[PDB]
Amino acid sequence: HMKKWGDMFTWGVSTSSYQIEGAANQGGRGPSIWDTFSKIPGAVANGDNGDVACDHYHRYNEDLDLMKWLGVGAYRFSIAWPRVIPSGYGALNKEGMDFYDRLIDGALERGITPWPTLYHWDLPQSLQDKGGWNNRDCAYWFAEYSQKMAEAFSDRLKNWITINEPFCSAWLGHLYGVMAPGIKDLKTGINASHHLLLGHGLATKAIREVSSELKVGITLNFTPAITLGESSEDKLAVELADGFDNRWFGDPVFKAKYPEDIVKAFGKEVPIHPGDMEIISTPLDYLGLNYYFRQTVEYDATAKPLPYKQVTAPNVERTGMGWEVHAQSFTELLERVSKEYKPKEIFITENGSAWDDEVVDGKVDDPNRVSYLERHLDAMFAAKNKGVPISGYFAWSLIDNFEWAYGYAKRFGIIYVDYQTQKRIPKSSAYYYQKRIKES
Amino acid sequence: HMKKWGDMFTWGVSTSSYQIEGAANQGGRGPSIWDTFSKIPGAVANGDNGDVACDHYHRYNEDLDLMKWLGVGAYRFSIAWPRVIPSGYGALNKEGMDFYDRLIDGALERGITPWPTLYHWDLPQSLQDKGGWNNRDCAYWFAEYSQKMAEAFSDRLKNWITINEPFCSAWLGHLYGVMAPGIKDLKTGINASHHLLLGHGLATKAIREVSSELKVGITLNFTPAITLGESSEDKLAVELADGFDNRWFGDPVFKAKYPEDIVKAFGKEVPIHPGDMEIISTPLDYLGLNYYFRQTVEYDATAKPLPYKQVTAPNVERTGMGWEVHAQSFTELLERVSKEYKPKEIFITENGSAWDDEVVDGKVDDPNRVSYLERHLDAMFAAKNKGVPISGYFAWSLIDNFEWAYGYAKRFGIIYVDYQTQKRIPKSSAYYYQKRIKES
Amino acid sequence: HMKKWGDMFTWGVSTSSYQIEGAANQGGRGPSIWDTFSKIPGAVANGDNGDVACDHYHRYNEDLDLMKWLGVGAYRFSIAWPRVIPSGYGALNKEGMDFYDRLIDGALERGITPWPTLYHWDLPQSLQDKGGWNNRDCAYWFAEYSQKMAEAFSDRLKNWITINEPFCSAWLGHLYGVMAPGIKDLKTGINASHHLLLGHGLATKAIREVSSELKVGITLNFTPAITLGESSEDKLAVELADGFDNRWFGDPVFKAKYPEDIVKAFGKEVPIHPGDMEIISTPLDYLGLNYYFRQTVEYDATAKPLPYKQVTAPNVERTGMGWEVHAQSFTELLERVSKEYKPKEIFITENGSAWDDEVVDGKVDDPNRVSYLERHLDAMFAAKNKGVPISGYFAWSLIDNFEWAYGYAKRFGIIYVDYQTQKRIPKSSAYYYQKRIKES
Ligand SMILES: OC[C@H]1NC[C@H](O)[C@@H](O)[C@@H]1O
Ligand SMILES: OC[C@H]1NC[C@H](O)[C@@H](O)[C@@H]1O
Ligand SMILES: OC[C@H]1NC[C@H](O)[C@@H](O)[C@@H]1O
């Protein structure tokens, strides 16, 4: 499983539209559910929103220059659906499409392959007003949007990702209400999860109809579950958390079914129509895998919707998010996914870490982020050397940005953003990543 | 046979002088046999000629910049003998030599290693008027020209190629008359083949006399032969086609003899003088291998000079040239050459494909050329992983150019040339090649 | 030993402060022992000195541009102790610190990792006036200087080297008197060797106290010894020369003891205080290995301090220094060092060769330097493929420079320096090294 001649590996960085673009009410853009959600008192730390963010809508040439300087071969970005179709379905916003044309063409001029993500959580509010992902029609609206983007951009862009982290859009957005649109209802979360996955499948078929050379995948985040206890009920807690976070989304895509143990525990029906599971399980060219941390759980008969709770394990390394740092879990997750779901290949579409950064003498020295990055790259390559088909790695993120309900206080960039001036300052982790790209 | 530490691989692009330079009657250049041949009604499609071509004589800085942008480490180009010695033998044209000085120095400033080919078919007409390659003296004229080029440029240029594709210069130029100088006579083709190969050997010795650190090879195109029939006579047809196309030129270089079955079938004498076969078979640092397609043949008792004919096999993928696409033959050819001729190392000095390209919105999306390139690189690395010493790959061609008797209608570039404006437009295949160079 | 996914390799070039900087009495710099030594007639060939050298203090941006052009990932340089602390201990010289800040920041802007060496022989004369390395306090002065440099620069610089080639500073500087400070006394050489090594250990501990992520090593030159004789006394000569050159410095660092056979043969006491050997042998992240040549010796009962003499072996290839070229010794040395001393990893911090160069038509063609470089890189990778953990290679040197007692007459650069104009001219070896960096 050692390197052989001709083998390739792609190095990238990742962002998303609402987190960096700004220009939220400029260039014809319509509001997203995160514009609305960010206006709710208490929804986002410090009352932050994405109105300006990193002003990447105006500063994209600088950010593209930083990518070329890093030496990445690829740039994972998302298209803001409400920027290009403000009404969700209907007329294209030519000014919005022109922005992505300039972004794409600028990347290609610099030798960077853009990897578009079609849905990274910024659903048009116009479609939320019709029920959003609770409405089955939203899967079809998404597929039509996806087709239009492929028709516009696939002459240049050959590697597509449909949706990003349906776990967050479905469960965090519709069951726990801590992400847009902020709904708290199990049935709604179930419906949303099915329509996100159906949208993925319909969009995949729509993209392939544009051209047979195009590649398509989905990005799923996986959160491996462990328990500190030995009781059978604590082992059940691990099984339930794994089903809720991981198998609920992986099983439809790769096995054409929902995990029966979770379906039974929910006691609700997934709104599956004829043809849905064939569409959701349509073959993919790759899995986009997001990994950051493992969760520690224990049984809790009182917890809902499933009888387990999170545990904060003692004496473990944690990031500024409070997330456990455990790179060995990354290796084991990659091996598990390859055996369980057998994706043709895997791209790490996100991995990274957030820490308290300080600017000293105009510079940012972030050794904790360097250490996380080094150890997780090592863990990834450990899996690749065992035969897991990992074809590339995208660092989350190129720049500090709007970290959803945490706002701007949580910095994931390898490049620092001073939001007072929009100055970009490469951190120590940027120089480390630059070296790794060149010298591997 | 996997990668080991220290192993190297060279990525390049290839062109030739008459096909790109233009400035055919500028800078003191004298006419070549292709200037003459292109003036004959019916000799070249659409009446095309190389008077202007890609105007690389003036635009070489842009083309070198495109090479740096692609990331190639090497540039295979040819020196126009009639630009540097218009009378074929005698005085150097200082203006022509200064052009190659500027080209070479510009490549080196950009980190690109130029690989000069001394003869890529543009014999000075002054020498054709004395018999060209039919005249034994032409081997010596070529060797003197080669010595002068090494004396001028080998302070910088360490890797030389003498001649390119003697199959074309000898048989297509002097037996079939479809390439310059347009002669149609078997004995003349035999004489030309021997004097091309003798010129190669004399030039190799002359270059090594300039400096012992210099490396020298020859570029041969090989066209593997198959048959769809099972008869013994169709198997004989394969042997005859292989002998005519491949062994006629490979056997003198690597085995110091002409293939006896073809000599006997011709019924003519090769004009071999004392010392010739030792000179032709002088040890080489590498073979430059050109590969594009395999030929399908069958026996034909009426055919001349040998009793076989070409067959257009049914239901196979073909390029815009009508050439079969069969990358597995590339792997098998590389393995066979390594066993049969055992060159110290192999450089793919040409491989590529031509398709009808369309400019849409100022861009050129050429998925069929991308696919050919991907599959032939895969096939080449398959041979390298079996132990074949392939040390580099040069894509034919950087830019669309004058495709000999096909004229400009046949486009081999990974960069499109709009001949009305001389604009260069990178095709999808350019972005693919750029990625492969970086990420392998 | 199987190249695997994730393995890295660092390509660099090396210089040192006194050899390139110039500006010896500018920018607040205080004199070093080499400023003083170079003023003594007969100490340096042609009366050369480092007053101007390559004027890199003023031309560093040009030199950094040349490094970026070569494509190196790393730049090994030394900090001039008397430029940053002119009195050796005490006040920092802000102008000197600012120079290294600009150098470091310029390298990082270009994607180059600076590798600082803290002591490359330019001891402040103010400290020599107090006994220099003969004075135990010099080990502590060095450690305090090292701590201040890490405090200033380790926000950016993570890989440190303490001292370079104590063989030269101790034996050539204090026993043979052919390098600064020009002393000729065995006991002084022994004292100096101990305080250099103690300084290394104290500085390593001081650097690690600044930040636990910092890496530290030492650079040792090793000169493998052979004999042409078969007698038992000539085999003893090999053991003595190996002990004098190599084990005297390697054994303290990696085995916490001085080689007992050499201690006995000297018959002198090393000024070891309790605790010193634990300090000297403090664990290192890597060994910086310098290799240029092997020595041939024979027994000589009359020789001092040890009964052997150098032999000039007949009929071997030699550089312009008179040094034997024998790349196989490099492979065997790397294997031996890894087996006997087991450094966690090895960086080749210096290897290279000097030849008489000639400028012809504004260019420098140096095939003998190319050949040495090619063969020693091959020999290094042979050791890596046997499992030796060689993580990078730094060519000595980026530019021609002041070759100590040989002056400017001995040119080690892959880039030529015309000292009349300070023009930099890349040699053939620069283009070769550029290719190796890209294509390996
Ligand atoms: O939480 C960090 C990172 N993980 C997942 C999301 O895709 C991304 O937008 C977010 O910023
Ligand atoms: O036919 C394509 C290509 N192959 C052979 C020749 O070397 C080159 O000049 C030509 O353009
Ligand atoms: O002698 C060549 C080279 N060897 C070792 C020294 O570190 C360096 O300064 C010197 O120039």
Numbering used by the authors:
A (entry chain A), B (entry chain B), C (entry chain C): 0 to 439
Task: Quote what the paper states about this structure.
We, therefore, re-introduced arginine, replacing the histidine 75 in this enzyme, creating the BglM-G1 variant H75R. There was, however, a major difference in electrostatic interactions between the mutation site and the active site nucleophile. The naturally occurring histidine at position 75 in BglM-G1 formed only a single hydrogen bond with the backbone oxygen of threonine 116, while arginine at position 75 formed, in addition to hydrogen bond interactions with residues Gln163 and Thr116, a salt bridge with the catalytic nucleophile glutamate at position 349 Fig. 2 CD spectroscopic analysis and X-ray crystal structure of BglM-G1 and its H75R variant. Because the crystal structure showed that arginine at position 75 forms a strong electrostatic interaction with the active nucleophile glutamate 349, this should lead to a more rigid substrate binding site in the variant. Asparagine 163 and Glutamate 349 were the two residues that had electrostatic interactions with both the inhibitor and Arginine 75. We thus inspected the B-factor of the atoms in the side chain of these two amino acids. A higher B-factor indicates higher flexibility in the crystal. The lower B-factors of residues Asparagine 163 and Glutamate 349 in the substrate binding site of BglM-G1’s H75R variant indeed suggest that the higher Km could be the result of a lower conformational flexibility caused by the stabilizing effect of the electrostatic network formed by Arginine 75.
Here we report, in contrast, on a naturally occurring mutation of an otherwise invariant residue in the β-glucosidase BglM-G1 that balances a trade-off between structural stability and enzyme activity. β-glucosidases are enzymes hydrolyzing β-glycosidic bonds in substrates ranging from glycosides, to glucosylated flavonoids, glucosylceramides, and oligosaccharides, releasing nonreducing terminal glucosyl residues (see Ketudat et al. for a comprehensive review). They are also one of the key enzymes in the bioconversion of cellulosic material. The otherwise invariant arginine at position 75 changed to a histidine in this protein, while the other 36 amino acids deemed necessary for the function and structural integrity of members of this protein family remained unchanged. Our data indicate that the natural mutation to histidine at position 75 leads to the loss of an extensive electrostatic network, including a salt bridge in the active site region and implies that evolution of BglM-G1 traded a decrease in thermal stability for improved catalytic efficiency.
